[PDB]
Chain length 41, copies 4
């Protein structure tokens, strides 16, 4: 059917679950990233 | 399985990851959505 | 791989995104659940 | 083509939803983990 899109999205769903763990486990990277976003606006 | 629901859902999966990055990178737009929800709910 | 698990899981992927929109837009609904968790824990 | 990967990713998408419920239902588990990450980083 639309196999690359469905596969890529699924891969991305894992990728967000990893990001959510990284946001709390490796907290300082989002601590820097949010500070940059709040500064830049 | 019929195709459309599973295709729409996976597209939405990517869309939620794009929305999380959008939340931090451009704070101000989801900030208006939340203010709109607090005013009306 | 049979249909029901993947169909339910994809439907569930939409379901979390609707729940996140709900968490901001309909703020009082999530409030009652969180209060119940704090109360007895 | 890739049913093991697509299945595991779909299962993971449910798995994250359960974790977000877990976060505000069992608040003292996020207490014990967030304290450890604050303390040693």
């Amino acid at each position: 059917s639309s196999d690359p899109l469905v596969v890529a999205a699924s891969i991305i769903g894992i990728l967000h679950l990893i990001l959510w763990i990284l946001d709390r486990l490796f907290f300082k990277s989002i601590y820097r990233f949010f500070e940059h976003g709040l500064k830049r606006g």
